[PDB]
Amino acid sequence: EDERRELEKVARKAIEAAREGNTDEVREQLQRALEIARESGSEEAFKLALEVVRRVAEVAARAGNVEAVKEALRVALEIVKEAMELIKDPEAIVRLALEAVRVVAEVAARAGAVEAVKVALRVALEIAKIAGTEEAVRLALEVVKRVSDIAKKAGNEDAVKEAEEVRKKIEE
Amino acid sequence: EARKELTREMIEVLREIEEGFKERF
């Protein structure tokens, strides 16, 4: 697929600008990756754009670039809405929604927002309720898995405690 | 306030994703 090798080029350019502090270049490449996924229409392209959003949000947070992180969260919302308009498959919308909810939850665990980590787990449980599929709860447990993992390596004890609770809630 | 803006946008983007999903279903 030639659509994939386009997002990799804009990913190298977006993560490079996230380190040197070129927040304006981050806005351009993130908006470009949105246009790449918007033109094709396939779920894989809408998905592959989320990796770029998650990739730049990691390096921007690791470099103290707070505004570049806020730009990634904005794009993560835009790919979801652009998918709800393009994608006709309701199950593909569920996957892309939890994949975006998972991204905003990993950045909140590093940032130790606690309240945002709680809302992310609260939203992720709600998305899997209307879906009612075994695929939805599998990805919902993955948002809890990533929140608990990232919060441990960060030493934020408030999130690993909330993650273990939400995991036990849907086990029944 | 810069970190408060980061957390505030996280809550908003999350509730917008949930809102758009409850409308399609």
Residue numbers in the entry:
A (entry chain A): 2 to 173
B (entry chain B): 179 to 203
Question: What does the publication say?
Answer:
We set out to design proteins that can switch between two well-defined and fully structured conformations. We reasoned that these goals could be collectively achieved with a “hinge”-like design in which two rigid domains move relative to each other while remaining individually folded. The hinge amplifies small local structural and chemical changes to achieve large global changes while the chemical environment for most residues remains similar throughout the conformational change, avoiding the need for global unfolding. Designing one of the resulting conformations to bind to a target effector couples the conformational equilibrium with target binding.
To generate a second conformation, a copy of the parent protein is rotated around a “pivot helix” and a new backbone conformation is then created by combining the first half of the original protein (domain 1), the second half of the copy (domain 2), and either the helix following the pivot helix from the original protein or the helix preceding the pivot helix from the rotated copy (“peptide”). Using a combination of Rosetta two-state design (see methods section for details) and proteinMPNN(27) with linked residue identities, a single amino acid sequence is generated that is compatible with the state X hinge as well as with the state Y hinge-peptide complex. We solved crystal structures for two designs, cs207 and cs074. For design cs207, crystals were obtained from two separate crystallization screens: one screen for the hinge alone, and one screen for the hinge in complex with the target peptide. In the absence of peptide the experimental structure agrees well with the state X design model, and the structure of the hinge-peptide complex agrees well with the state Y design model. The crystal structures of hinge cs207 in both designed states demonstrate the accuracy with which two very different conformational states of the same protein can now be designed.
